[PDB]
């Protein structure tokens, strides 16, 4: 029938002002940006570490407000042991008229991967465990018809147990600057997206699997680029340029006949490139480092692959409930986004 307003505190920390439940103490800043400033927290309610975003006037444009509903949709929707989940979102506002202000908490992580693959030296039941959690979280994602469109080291998450959980998933949107050069940002992203070849998939996150799990295994980054068209061409000198068949799929003409320019190149010897690697590891990579998306190992089949034999369980890798994608088609302004999400912060449901 109804619901209880906490009680909130007020806490400057870097300049930006805090207001949160009496619950969250302890508030330490970790970071901060475009993408919202985060603090550390401990929630006395459940004895849990958490992580609190803090989007402040995410409704200055129609731009900001939809990407704050995203957002929320997006964190609301996902309850996996490897996708990060919405343990709270609250906001001081009292009603529709003074919201302007959002407030996510989730589980507080302790490392990204990134930070991990240089503290430590990782064994092949390491990349295993890693990548095998990765792919748990995407078969889950993948089926809300959900894409990440930017996996990378950086949104990986982890704790001293190297338990994993995915994060940022459905919302990168990088300028041409930020995708300029030697740069991490485009490192792991699928040839079609980083060149536009065709409307893409799922499949792209998989691609950004094969870079990662490549990289746990050698130490290095597989196709460090100093631009885009650098990165091609050490992509394709290891899968080889695209056939017949793949051409015709690429529905940008200018793309299409860029690549009917470059000299044909064989697929290389997986085994000749990473040398003393476990074969399921070099065969499973193979599978998901395909040019042609169609043909890419899905999230759900690599599962089931024998490289991952001591972790896999079909009875615990699940799938999620539909995901309803229609608000991205919409049209609406500043004050209807706005509602929309003051909607969904009122009617969140903690987790039990
Ligand atoms: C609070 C929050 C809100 C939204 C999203 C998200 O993925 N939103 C997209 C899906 C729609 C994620 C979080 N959680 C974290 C955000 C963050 O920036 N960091 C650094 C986080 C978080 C959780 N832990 N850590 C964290 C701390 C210390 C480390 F060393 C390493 C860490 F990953």
Redesign the pocket.
């Known amino acids: 029938m109804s619901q209880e307003r906490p009680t909130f505190y007020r806490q400057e920390l870097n300049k930006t002002i805090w207001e949160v439940p009496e619950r969250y103490q302890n508030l330490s800043p970790?970071?901060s940006g475009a993408?919202?400033s985060?603090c550390?927290a401990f929630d006395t309610k459940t004895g849990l570490r958490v992580?609190?975003?803090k989007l402040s006037r995410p409704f200055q444009s129609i731009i900001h407000a939809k990407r704050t509903y995203?957002?929320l949709r997006?964190?609301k929707h996902?309850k996996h042991e490897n996708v990060?989940g919405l343990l709270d979102v609250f906001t001081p506002a009292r009603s529709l008229e003074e919201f302007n202000d959002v407030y996510?908490?989730?589980?507080?992580?302790?490392?990204?991967l990134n930070?991990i693959v240089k503290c430590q030296k990782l064994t092949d039941d390491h990349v295993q465990f890693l990548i095998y959690q990765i792919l748990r979280g995407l078969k889950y994602i993948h089926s809300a018809d959900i894409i990440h469109r930017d996996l990378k080291p950086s949104?990986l998450?982890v704790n001293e147990d190297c338990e994993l959980?995915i994060?940022?998933?459905?919302?990168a949107r990088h300028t041409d600057d930020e995708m300029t050069g030697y740069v991490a940002t485009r490192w792991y992203r699928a040839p079609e997206i980083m060149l536009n070849w065709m409307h893409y998939n799922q499949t792209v996150d998989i691609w950004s699997v094969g870079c990662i799990m490549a990289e746990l295994l050698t130490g290095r980054t597989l196709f460090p680029g100093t631009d885009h068209i650098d990165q091609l061409k050490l992509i394709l000198r290891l899968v080889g340029t695209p056939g017949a068949e793949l051409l015709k799929k690429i529905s940008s003409e200018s793309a299409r006949n860029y690549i009917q320019s470059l000299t044909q190149m064989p697929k290389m010897n997986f085994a000749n490139v990473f040398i003393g690697a476990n074969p399921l590891a070099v065969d499973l990579l193979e599978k998901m480092l395909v040019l042609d998306s169609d043909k890419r190992i899905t999230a759900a089949q690599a599962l089931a692959h024998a490289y991952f034999a001591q972790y896999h369980d079909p009875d615990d890798e699940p799938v999620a409930d539909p995901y309803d994608q229609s608000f991205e088609s919409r049209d609406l302004l500043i004050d209807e986004w706005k509602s929309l999400t003051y909607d969904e912060v009122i009617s969140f449901v903690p987790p039990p």
Do not use: Q, S, W
């Open positions: 970790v970071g993408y919202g985060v550390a992580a609190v975003k995203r957002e997006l964190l996902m990060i996510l908490v989730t589980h507080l992580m302790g490392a990204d930070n949104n998450a959980k994060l940022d998933f459905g919302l």
